[PDB]
Design an enzyme around this catalytic site. Structure first.
Site, mmCIF file in Angstrom:
data_model
loop_
_atom_site.group_PDB
_atom_site.id
_atom_site.type_symbol
_atom_site.label_atom_id
_atom_site.label_comp_id
_atom_site.label_asym_id
_atom_site.label_seq_id
_atom_site.Cartn_x
_atom_site.Cartn_y
_atom_site.Cartn_z
ATOM 1 N N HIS A 150 -1.601 0.451 7.329
ATOM 2 C CA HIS A 150 -1.651 0.584 5.882
ATOM 3 C C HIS A 150 -1.621 2.041 5.504
ATOM 4 C CE1 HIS A 150 -5.781 0.154 7.307
ATOM 5 N NE2 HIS A 150 -6.292 0.612 6.177
ATOM 6 N N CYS A 152 0.823 -1.217 0.000
ATOM 7 C CA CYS A 152 0.000 0.000 0.000
ATOM 8 C C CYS A 152 0.860 1.272 0.000
ATOM 9 C CB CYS A 152 -0.988 -0.005 1.168
ATOM 10 S SG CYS A 152 -0.411 -0.832 2.674
#
Ligand SMILES: [Zn+2]
Ligand SMILES: [Zn+2]
Ligand SMILES: [Zn+2]
Ligand SMILES: [Zn+2]
Ligand SMILES: [Zn+2]
Ligand SMILES: [Zn+2]
Ligand SMILES: [Zn+2]
Lengths: 438, 84, 59, 96
Positions: free
Chosen positions: A394, A146
């Site tokens: 993330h 990510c």
């Protein structure tokens, strides 16, 4: 959805058509290549009332007249002389004065610079499909990625990078010509998939180049430096390679994202200002501790601090007085990238993530952060945030595409989101694009 | 000084210091790209001399078409080269 | 008759209306193009509850 | 003998442009409007009015956006910019 029947009537004649397109191309040329004063006095002065900016001003297609809107003087002209089309001199759009509407849905008029080649163009190329027209598409994680994909999203929604890629600049100069060997190429493939029809093949091909070499910021620096390599590698000789390394590169990265700081170190005692330096940057890292507003972080970044440096003696005067250091922007980039320093690493070996909400504006003014000033205004277009802890977290990107609509990229998930919601993000990177300079 | 005052004419002192749209074409041919609202004197001072500039980068969507043969999205100005 | 006030308001109004007219021209033309290009145009999906992607779907 | 007021208003606007000051006024205004969020507000309103009236027609739409766009301009901006225009006009005009 209809199409002005009047301009259709003109297009039946093949010669009258080419007059219209030559004229549209000429006006638009003139509008992009006239100095303010010239423009005001010759594309925004009204033939009839002689007012500047009496609303929009329309340059007649069939004659040299210019007529304002607020007093219907172009309308009058269209009624009196029978010239029913005018180009708006603020934007080069074409108005039909019988439809009382703009003619925006005719591709040939929109793409008039290709008029000589139109039959080739319109048969051998298609308009973009509805789904791909804004490059909107998730990029699946598949292995703690990510920090890659969120950076990539802001990049492939960056107007400068899109223009560059679709212009084929890299494609027509690359020597390696391979998505699995060359970064710029891989990025070209992603633009291909997201905006055309070839949707991870490009992003797949991007980890493979990364096989040949957690923090999203580090990856930003990593990826832009690669882009720059690719440009250097395509250069035709050693001489140009020296320049692009040591002097002035002209690649997409170095003509879009690079500014330079003045780092002024001055000694109180005797104003020695000799450790003063001009250093390039491709982004700015701001301290956010106990701060609540991006402008405060910029004030911080910009204020005079005292250098605590044991046990310093001014080279020049012997004074044990701390040198006074100040940072100021010497040259601004077209896209200003700001990093808020959220991952504070500790001497004890641990890490902290600071979660402080830092307020940031949709339009940012950098005039107070330069050095020797008029307004210098940027427009927020991208944000990358971090969710979770320093260990397991993330990244999520947010991008403002054309029209003003913001989207949220959470790996495969792409989702509409309001400007009002985007502003409440705990921001990590911020991408601002230059918008006005007085 | 008074906002309500009737205007008689232009100061004679000031006066001392002083039509087809298509007639602009030849000065335009010699004039480099211009921006609505980015002042050149200020881009000279504050920005890198070789800087790229897109004014109102988001005010329209990117003008491109897609090649039917290979699917590549092409900028208007890249289309003719890509075909021919 | 013309006064400093009449003229200044005139100039401000000229500027504002011109700019407004520009912004609106671009929006309506863009939307005219889109609706003509895509007779089947679907706005991208919005969800108050943060769950549905641009086509009303999930992971 | 009197002057053509229409012609005088035009010359006044013309001195503004020649002096450089019309670009200043214009730029101060855009920078001000931009930073207060007005441009973005005008764009939203346009979209709302297109939705409401189920029309993209420029003239129809403008008719409903413009009046509200003008109201949205703040007093600070309006006042500041009028002050600026006024001072520029004093350098230019004689007054009875
Ligand atoms: Zn028509
Ligand atoms: Zn007029
Ligand atoms: Zn005419
Ligand atoms: Zn390559
Ligand atoms: Zn470079
Ligand atoms: Zn000293
Ligand atoms: Zn092709």
């Amino acid at each position: 959805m209809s199409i002005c029947p009047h301009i259709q009537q003109v297009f039946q004649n093949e010669k009258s058509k080419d007059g219209v397109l030559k004229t549209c191309n000429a006006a638009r040329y003139i509008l992009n290549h006239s100095v303010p004063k010239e423009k005001f006095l010759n594309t925004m002065k009204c033939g009839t009332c002689h007012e500047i900016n009496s609303g929009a001003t329309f340059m007649c297609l069939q004659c040299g007249f210019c007529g304002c809107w607020n007093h219907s003087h172009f309308l009058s002209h269209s009624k009196q002389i029978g010239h029913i089309f005018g180009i708006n001199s603020n934007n080069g759009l074409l108005f039909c004065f019988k439809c009382e509407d703009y003619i925006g849905n005719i591709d040939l008029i929109n793409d008039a610079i290709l008029a000589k080649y139109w039959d080739d163009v319109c048969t051998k190329t298609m308009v973009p499909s509805m789904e791909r027209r804004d490059g909107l598409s998730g990029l699946i994680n598949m292995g703690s990625t990510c920090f890659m994909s969120s950076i990539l999203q802001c990049l492939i929604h960056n107007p400068y990078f899109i223009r560059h890629s679709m212009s084929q600049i890299h494609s027509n100069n690359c020597k390696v010509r391979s998505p699995d060997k060359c970064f710029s190429c891989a990025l070209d493939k992603i633009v291909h998939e997201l905006y055309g029809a070839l949707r991870q093949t490009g992003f797949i091909y991007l980890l493979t180049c990364a096989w040949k070499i957690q923090d999203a910021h580090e990856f930003w620096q990593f990826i832009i430096n690669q882009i720059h390599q690719s440009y250097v590698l395509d250069l035709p000789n050693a001489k140009e390679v020296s320049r692009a390394n040591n002097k002035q590169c002209e690649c997409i990265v170095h003509t879009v994202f690079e500014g330079s700081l003045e780092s002024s170190i001055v000694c109180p005692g005797c104003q020695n200002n000799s450790k003063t330096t001009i250093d390039p940057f491709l982004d700015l890292s701001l301290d956010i501790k106990d701060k609540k507003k991006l402008y405060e972080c910029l004030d911080s970044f910009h204020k005079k601090e005292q250098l605590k440096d044991f046990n310093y003696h001014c080279g020049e005067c012997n004074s044990t007085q701390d040198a006074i250091k100040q940072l100021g922007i010497h040259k601004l980039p077209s896209v200003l990238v700001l990093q808020l320093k959220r991952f504070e690493h500790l001497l004890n070996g641990s890490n902290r993530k600071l979660d402080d909400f830092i307020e940031f504006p949709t339009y940012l003014n950098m005039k107070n952060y330069c050095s020797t000033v008029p307004d210098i205004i940027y427009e927020l277009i991208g944000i990358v945030s971090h969710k979770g802890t320093v260990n397991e977290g993330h990244y999520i990107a947010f991008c403002k595409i054309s029209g003003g609509q913001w989207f949220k990229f959470n790996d495969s998930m792409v989702s509409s989101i309001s400007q009002e919601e985007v502003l409440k993000e705990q921001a990590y990177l911020l991408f601002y694009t230059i918008r006005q300079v007085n | 000084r008074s906002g309500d005052a009737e205007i008689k004419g232009i100061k004679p002192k000031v006066i001392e210091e002083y039509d087809s749209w298509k007639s602009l074409m030849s000065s335009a041919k010699d004039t480099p790209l211009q921006y609505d609202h980015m002042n050149r004197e200020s881009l000279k001072k504050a920005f890198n001399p070789n800087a790229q500039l897109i004014e109102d980068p988001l005010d329209k969507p990117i003008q491109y078409r897609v090649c039917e043969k290979c699917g590549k999205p092409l900028a208007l100005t890249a289309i003719v080269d890509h075909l021919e | 008759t013309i006064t400093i006030d009449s003229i200044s308001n005139g100039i401000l109004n000229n500027l504002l209306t011109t700019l407004i007219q520009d912004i609106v021209a671009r929006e309506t033309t863009q939307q005219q193009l889109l609706k003509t290009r895509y007779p089947d145009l679907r706005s991208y999906y919005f969800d108050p509850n943060g769950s549905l992607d641009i086509n009303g779907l999930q992971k | 003998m009197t002057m053509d007021t229409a012609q005088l208003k035009s010359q006044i606007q013309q001195y503004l442009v020649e002096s450089g000051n019309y670009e200043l006024i214009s730029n101060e205004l855009k920078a001000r409007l931009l930073q207060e969020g007005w441009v973005d507000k005008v764009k939203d309103l346009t979209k709302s009015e297109m939705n409401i009236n189920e029309s993209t027609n420029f003239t129809q739409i403008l008719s409903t956006v413009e009046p509200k766009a003008l109201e949205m301009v703040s007093d600070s901006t309006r006042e500041t910019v009028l002050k600026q225009i006024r001072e520029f006009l004093e350098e230019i005009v004689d007054t009875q």
